[PDB]
Amino acid sequence: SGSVSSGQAHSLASLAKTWSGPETEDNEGVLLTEKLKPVDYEYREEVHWMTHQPRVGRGSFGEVHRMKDKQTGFQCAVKKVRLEVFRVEELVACAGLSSPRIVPLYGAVREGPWVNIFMELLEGGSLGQLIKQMGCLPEDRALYYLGQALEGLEYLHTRRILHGDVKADNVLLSSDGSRAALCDFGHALCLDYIPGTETHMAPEVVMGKPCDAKVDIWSSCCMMLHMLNGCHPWTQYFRGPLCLKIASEPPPIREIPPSCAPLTAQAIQEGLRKEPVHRASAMELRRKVGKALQEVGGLKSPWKGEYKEPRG
């Protein structure tokens, strides 16, 4: 027996809130696309759907896999999360939102102490995977992707939603590399913040100050440094715990490659102001990034091909 239904995002959000003892096989959830089909109110791994192939990635609180609905044959992505680490915000924050810059959820189904979150599969892979493959990305492609991420952030921030862990591993690419989109709202907050990836955390985060949407802007510029250098900020200069260094050192603008053009360096600096009051908004930074991209001649580099040496 189970209570898995087909429905809309608001219904899934209401159920998710009830997910927040002895481990059960309780099966409940809401599927948001007709391509994933409950069978007699159940939807269970190995019975109605299955994972296959190597891991597709790591996500917040759980691993991400390719999966297939056994009946429909539909392929999508799934993140499996233990119930005790599941954050409800992942299934509430984007309920009723739709943007080309946000990867759509396909639903979520609990099975005992596991929550399975379903999402559109993007064959282009993550931006993190691209950086690893290519060593690092040229300035024009980096600006192009940062701009699209910022477009997604504008959409969220106007709705008082913090993404909470903006980084290359959480930005997915279309099959031809032309479109980037934010995914993974495990650290999201509808404006207590649960910090994301240490290297990308803003000073106000490590200082335990009230966090707002500016946290995502600092993260996005750490992601920009990652694209450009091929490594996360701080890591090549510092050793152990980074929290005190983030709070105390100058913002990591020394990691901007000397080859970057003036508007590029300026944009990164504005997104990395230590005091969030002085830090650019998504709206502001997106405009600056667009001008920076125009000033280097627009997007010209092919999305793959030439390995570029990262900073050693």
- Shorter beta-carbon distance to ligand 0WB: residue 111 or 255: 111
Q: Binding residue per annotation — 42?
A: no
* Rounded CA separation 205/215 (Å): 8
The only residue of 69, 89, 154, 184 in contact with ligand 0WB, by rule CB under 6 A: 184
Q: Please give the C-alpha separations between residue 125 and each of 97, 98, 171, 226, in angstroms, as whole numbers.
A: 23, 21, 9, 17
Q: Which residue, 126 or 264, has its beta carbon nearer to ligand 0WB?
A: 126
Clarify whether 216 is annotated catalytic: no
Piece of the chain touching ligand 0WB by CB under 6 A; list 19-27, 52-60, 148-156, 251-259: 52-60
Closest separation between CB of residue 36 and ligand 0WB, Å? Answer: 12
Task: Give the Cβ contact number of residue 192 at 10 Å.
Answer: 4
Q: Does 169 bind ligand 0WB (CB under 6 A)?
A: yes
Find the binding residues for ligand 0WB in span 196-225 (CB under 6 A): none
Residue ranges in the chain assigned as alpha helix (H): 9-16, 89-92, 127-134, 139-157, 203-206, 214-229, 243-248, 262-271, 282-295
Applying CB under 6 A, among 15, 136, 172, 217 the residue interacting with ligand 0WB is 172
Closer residue to ligand 0WB in complex, CB, 163/279 = 163
Q: Which candidate in 140, 165, 169, 184 is catalytic?
A: 165
Count of CB atoms situated within 10 Å of the CB of 83:
15
- Measured from the Cβ of residue 189, the count of other Cβ atoms closer than 10 Å reads 20
Among 51, 170, 199, 219, binds ligand 0WB (CB under 6 A): 170
Smallest Cα–Cα separation from 255: which of 240, 241, 234, 271? 234
Segment near ligand 0WB (CB under 6 A), from 32-40, 164-172, 235-243, 266-274?
164-172
Residues facing residue 51 across a β-bridge = 67
Q: What is the C-alpha to C-alpha distance for residues 302 and 142, in angstroms, rounded to an integer?
A: 12
Q: Is 255 annotated as ligand-binding?
A: no
| Interatomic CA distance for residues 173 and 124, integer angstroms | 5
**What SS3 class is residue 225?**
helix
Asked if residue 171 belongs to a known ligand binding site, the reply is: no
Should residue 119 be labelled a site residue for ligand 0WB when binding is judged by CB under 6 A? yes
How far apart are the C-alpha atoms of 215 and 200, rounded to whole Å? 9
| Residues marked as catalytic | 165
Binding-site residue numbers are: 56-64, 79
Q: Can you give the binding site for ligand 0WB, defined by CB under 6 A?
A: 56-57, 59, 64, 77-79, 117, 119, 121-122, 125-126, 169-170, 172, 183-184, 186
